[PDB]
Amino acid sequence: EVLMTQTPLSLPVNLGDQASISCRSSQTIVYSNGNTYLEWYLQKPGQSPKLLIYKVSNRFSGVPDRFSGSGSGTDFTLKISRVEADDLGVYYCFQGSHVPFTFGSGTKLEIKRADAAPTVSIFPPSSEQLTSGGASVVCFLNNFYPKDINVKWKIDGSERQNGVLNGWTDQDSKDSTYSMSSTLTLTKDEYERHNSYTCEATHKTSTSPIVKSFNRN
Amino acid sequence: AVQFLESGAELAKPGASVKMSCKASGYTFTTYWMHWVKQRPGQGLEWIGFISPNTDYTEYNQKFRDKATLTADKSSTTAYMQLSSLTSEDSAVYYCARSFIGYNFDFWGQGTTLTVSSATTTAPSVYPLVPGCSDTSGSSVTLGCLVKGYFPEPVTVKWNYGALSSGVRTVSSVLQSGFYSLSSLVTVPSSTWPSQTVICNVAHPASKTELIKRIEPR
């Protein structure tokens, strides 16, 4: 099978800068008709891939002029000039010359931007959750950069490790920030045995933690 | 326009077979090949095979030789893929896409999420995420829906039927004892809520449900 090797695996880029994505085929992929069926696709988070470039260097309809593809033989390049916030996602090359058709190993374009501190919200469980026998306390950290963040939970001043799970958004299409939920799930019985619940978020944007807290009055 | 409606989410038992469909519109169905592509969670794309509807000619990636069977139906302009002897390794998103001339996958369906598991379908519970009674917000307030206890993937969330999309953050699901949960949050100006309606629309295709929930203060 034709191996389609892409580098880099991940590509951090400032807005307005140029990104170059390389694709190396394990053999030539000129088809018996003289055409090279080499395509580039972009897949944005939770979406189907979308075609960008075909036959090496041809822009698909609607693709902006700042996407260009070039190469020959076993060496192909996608360039994106003047990168914009919505260019993020995974780029794949693809060869449709030799069966089986194969795609590249994929390059995640990521946006670099200035640091941004999280806005933290804490959400007590809804009384609507109580007959499930569970109670989720959610700490939400909105619009921060970079992605790495620490979240600490406290219950009546004592720190807690069990029952905590964390989920992230993809990088925002518009401001290029991340958000994340930290969810402490307890039994309804544990929840009701305690009074204050605190989440503290620590991020490189400040030496001070952002502490959000409530009491079931 | 060229569109593909794909079945969405399917749950199947280890060792079973499952069929999925891709209804094509927006072009002469017998003029173009229909291809299928596999994508495992966090992984790349793998081409499976194609069928020409006009002659029923099929070509396969030999890796899927006894795994996939591609069929098609002219009159209903629908392409089909059957997957047999299912294992957890078959859990993936399956895209159909047509191929054009000079170029391939100009248009792709949205993908069917297939989960292979012995566990049964569970629609999500949905809970409001709203500030504590004494919370003092500045110029914005963040509200949400906690979607809990569902199986299999995916769930999607829209806000006001899709009309609130600015400041929506839907985080990735987490799995716990066989069930998934996620939160979807929106940030609005503090002057707009509770005075204006904020609604989350929680879709869970494996159970064929949309849950519409009006979000209100505690």
Author numbering:
A (entry chain L): 1 to 217
B (entry chain H): 1 to 218
Any passages from the paper?
An established carbohydrate-based cancer marker is the Thomsen-Friedenreich (TF) antigen (Galβ1-3GalNAcα), which is typically found O-linked to serine or threonine residues. Here, we examine the specificity of a potentially diagnostic and therapeutic monoclonal antibody (mAb JAA-F11) that was raised against the TF antigen. JAA-F11 preferentially binds to tumor tissue over normal, and in vivo it enhances survival and decreases metastasis in the mouse 4T1 metastatic model, indicating a potential for this mAb to be used, after humanization, in cancer patient therapy.
The overall JAA-F11 Fab fold in ribbons (heavy chain residues in blue, light chain in green) indicating the CDRs (heavy chain in light blue, light chain in yellow). b. The conserved disulfide bond between CysL23 and CysL93 is shown. a Values in parentheses are for highest-resolution shell (2.2–2.1 Å). Computational docking of the TF disaccharide was performed with AutoDock 3.05 to identify possible poses of the antigen in the Fab JAA-F11 binding site. Pose 1 from the docking was both top ranked in terms of cluster population, and lowest energy, and explained the specificity of this mAb for α-linked TF antigen. Protein residues (yellow carbon frame) involved in hydrogen bonds (black lines) or hydrophobic interactions with the TF antigen are shown. b. Depiction of the stacking interaction between the Gal and the TrpH33 (r  =  4.0 Å, θ  =  12.1°, φ  =  90.3°); the geometry of this interaction is comparable to literature values (lower left). c. In the case of JAA-F11, automated docking was able to generate a 3D model for the immune complex that was consistent with data from STD-NMR experiments performed on the same system.
